[PDB]
Amino acid sequence: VTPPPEKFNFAEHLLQTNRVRPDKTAFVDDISSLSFAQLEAQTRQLAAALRAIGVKREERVLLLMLDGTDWPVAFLGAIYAGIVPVAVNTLLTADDYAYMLEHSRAQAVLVSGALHPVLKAALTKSDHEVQRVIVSRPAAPLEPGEVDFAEFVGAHAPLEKPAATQADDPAFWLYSSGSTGRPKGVVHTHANPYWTSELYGRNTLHLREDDVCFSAAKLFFAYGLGNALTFPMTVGATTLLMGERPTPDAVFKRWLGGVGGVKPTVFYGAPTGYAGMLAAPNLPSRDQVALRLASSAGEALPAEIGQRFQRHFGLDIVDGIGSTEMLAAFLSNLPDRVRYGTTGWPVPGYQIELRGDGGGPVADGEPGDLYIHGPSSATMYWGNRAKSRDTFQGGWTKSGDKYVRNDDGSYTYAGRTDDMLKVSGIYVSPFEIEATLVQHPGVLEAAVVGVADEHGLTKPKAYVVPRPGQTLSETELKTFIKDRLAPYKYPRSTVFVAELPKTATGKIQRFKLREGVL
Numbered sequence: 001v002t003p004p005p006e007k008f009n010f011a012e013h014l015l016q017t018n019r020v021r022p023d024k025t026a027f028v029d030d031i032s033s034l035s036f037a038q039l040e041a042q043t044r045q046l047a048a049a050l051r052a053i054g055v056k057r058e059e060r061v062l063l064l065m066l067d068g069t070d071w072p073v074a075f076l077g078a079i080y081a082g083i084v085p086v087a088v089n090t091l092l093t094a095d096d097y098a099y100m101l102e103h104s105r106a107q108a109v110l111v112s113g114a115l116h117p118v119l120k121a122a123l124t125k126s127d128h129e130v131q132r133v134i135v136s137r138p139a140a141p142l143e144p145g146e147v148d149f150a151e152f153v154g155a156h157a158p159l160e161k162p163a164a165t166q167a168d169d170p171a172f173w174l175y176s177s178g179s180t181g182r183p184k185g186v187v188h189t190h191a192n193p194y195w196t197s198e199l200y201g202r203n204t205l206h207l208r209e210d211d212v213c214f215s216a217a218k219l220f221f222a223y224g225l226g227n228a229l230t231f232p233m234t235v236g237a238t239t240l241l242m243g244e245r246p247t248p249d250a251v252f253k254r255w256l257g258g259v260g261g262v263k264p265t266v267f268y269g270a271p272t273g274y275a276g277m278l279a280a281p282n283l284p285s286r287d288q289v290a291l292r293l294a295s296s297a298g299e300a301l302p303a304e305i306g307q308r309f310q311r312h313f314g315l316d317i318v319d320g321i322g323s324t325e326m327l328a329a330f331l332s333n334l335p336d337r338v339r340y341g342t343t344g345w346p347v348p349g350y351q352i353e354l355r356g357d358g359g360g361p362v363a364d365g366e367p368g369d370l371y372i373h374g375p376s377s378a379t380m381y382w383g384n385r386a387k388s389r390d391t392f393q394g395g396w397t398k399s400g401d402k403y404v405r406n407d408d409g410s411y412t413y414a415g416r417t418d419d420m421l422k423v424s425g426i427y428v429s430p431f432e433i434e435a436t437l438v439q440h441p442g443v444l445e446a447a448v449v450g451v452a453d454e455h456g457l458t459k460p461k462a463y464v465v466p467r468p469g470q471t472l473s474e475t476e477l478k479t480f481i482k483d484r485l486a487p488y489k490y491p492r493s494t495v496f497v498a499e500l501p502k503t504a505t506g507k508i509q510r511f512k513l514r515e516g517v518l
């Protein structure tokens, strides 16, 4: 793979690549579609619109939008103008967005109408620098100053040339959370999604022009950003986007060609999603779908889920591990080489290290801390030098995982080194859940650990000490957590206990809870 030139604008690169297929569908969702030509026009018109309102090169804008054909226009349009889009989760609270607006110093916000209310709350309570709010598909009247995304794009002539960016300049940000502290702004360069899209999308998955890509993982996830934007645009594939929550019925409807007259040939999701679909009553048969490749990421794929998917569809699930910091997978099974119970082999282009307790090599079969050296690594966490020093160490990126290398060169996941839990393939901090539970007036203490469910998938499990003298029923506690935590963070069960095992210094002995002692 030939490195990108030093003068390089990722958005312009993706546009140029597809000037050979102007009338092929680039993106299609429930209500709209965009050829590569139409996408290029609207991308460059949005870039001009953003510059016209005074957003200058290297400044950030907040991109808070459901998956839809407007999403890649917003993302590539900012990048084409040398403006840095900060692409964020659509299921967060006003407080979360308030912090992101201040931390990013976003100068404009591109928001889906359905998300305007939470953004309104975030703008009102924050010390933001937002100059303009641009609402894609408004769901309510427009407040003074705000503009409709389609009118905004339609009102400016396409920018004549891209910003003269370098390949190592920041191009976009994603946020990722550790076990405590604020979400971390992961800064990715113009080069990084070129490397992931060439090394993984093209050379590992073998995506191609006649593919139709469909990702249960949303575009604001690093995984989804590759699956359904950078990978397909790199090979000219057509991408199906879906705004709504990715339930089995929603997914099946798309698999069967219920949207845009296209049937997906490549599907991406988390193992939890695959388990959910395999259990659905209306699982399609192979003759009904056009899938040729099924990708999985976010959490380890239990062998039995892959085996059941293979037995039903005649297709393996290809399990790879990536991270927000590395942007896409660096360890992966191959489409024609799958070993269930492992994450496969290093992606060519990435060097992998397992380090022991002195930082040195570990022997095959023993766990070590995983570190990755690859050309797609994020450069830093914006504004957090301490965590950046901890993570990005002179060419090597600490993943937070432990892995075991097998005799055939494959790698088996062996857990985290930080307490973080991956539930439905999404980061969850047990300390957040604990902190939420102890604000219930009936809870004295709480400890949360991860437990494998019947399918081998990790879920939170809560141990709660009731506050003496307070009626506390499981049902009232479930309702308490319903409106305070996103559903994927719900504890699978809650065990009420009279005490928690504690050292003798006030620390909960969480491993005894993992061990089943209570």
Ligand SMILES: [C]C1=N[C]=C(C(=O)O=P([O])([O])O[C][C]2O[C](N3[C]=NC4=C3N=[C]N=C4[N])[C]([O])[C]2[O])S1
Binding pocket: 176, 222, 223, 226, 296, 297, 298, 299, 300, 301, 319, 320, 321, 322, 323, 324, 325, 327, 328, 329, 343, 399, 400, 401, 413, 416, 422, 425, 426, 427
């Ligand atoms: C491609 C891709 N990108 C991204 C991803 C992810 O997931 O990211 P985040 O959120 O940052 O996270 C990371 C983590 O998670 C986990 N995983 C993933 N994948 C996997 C896993 N594990 C196991 N296996 C697999 N496949 C870990 O922890 C990491 O570090 S993807």
